[PDB]
């Protein structure tokens, strides 16, 4: 299972999302839950860089299984909307694949 | 092959996103790339319906693997940045899986 730990500060701004584990839905190469979450993650991160002035702190296990996004300029509205979008997309995957991915707000 | 037709109007606002071939046979790579694009698309629509006030004309034919977003308030800046985030995410997929997905701007 992939777990997605989200931390949201006093003002409601998303400052960290930490995604850990593997989906364990199918075989390597054909796991659709992993394909879903990955496309949404990397898509969002790259879009932030590409469409806004925010430059997030990114740290990850380049062998798979661990990605960390820390927001820097948390006040950036464009970047915060992209992060929200990401969360809603991943929630959409959670509600149909219950046992492969978990969101936890802190 | 998944095709993604994107229509931009004279002012730069995204009008239409059409994805097709979702539910078609496909070659090696299709299952995951289709899972990636669809999680990004349906994720984006949900975000546009939950985070903004825009209510786009949406037509999903689950049987056809034909999915169509038509923008209504094209001046909704938030909806428009969710759409351009989706495009970026879709481009990210194209860059590495050129054989399974194609984007066409109209």
């Amino acid at each position: 299972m992939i777990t997605v730990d989200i931390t949201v500060n006093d003002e409601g701004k998303v400052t960290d999302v930490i995604m850990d584990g593997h989906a364990d839905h199918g075989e390597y190469g054909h796991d659709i839950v992993s394909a879903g979450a990955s496309a949404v993650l990397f898509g969002s991160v790259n879009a932030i860089i590409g469409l806004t002035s925010e430059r997030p702190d990114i740290n990850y296990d380049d062998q798979g299984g661990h990605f960390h996004i820390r927001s820097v300029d948390t006040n950036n509205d464009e970047a915060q909307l992209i992060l929200q979008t990401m969360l809603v997309s991943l929630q959409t995957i959670e509600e149909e694949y219950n046992e492969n991915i978990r969101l936890n707000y802190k | 092959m998944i095709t993604v037709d994107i229509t931009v109007n004279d002012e730069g606002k995204v009008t239409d996103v059409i994805m097709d071939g979702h539910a078609d046979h496909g070659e090696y790579g299709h299952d995951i790339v289709s899972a990636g694009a669809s999680a990004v698309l349906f994720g984006s629509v949900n975000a546009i319906i939950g985070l903004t006030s825009e209510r786009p004309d949406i037509n999903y034919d689950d049987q056809g693997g034909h999915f169509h977003i038509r923008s209504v308030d094209t001046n909704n800046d938030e909806a428009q940045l969710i759409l351009q985030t989706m495009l970026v995410s879709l481009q990210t997929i194209e860059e590495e899986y050129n054989e399974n997905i194609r984007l066409n701007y109209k």
Partner: peptide, 11 residues
């Protein structure tokens, strides 16, 4: 680059 199997295991 992008890896759609970033969150899938080996075994």
């Amino acid at each position: 680059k992008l890896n759609l199997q970033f969150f899938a295991s080996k075994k």
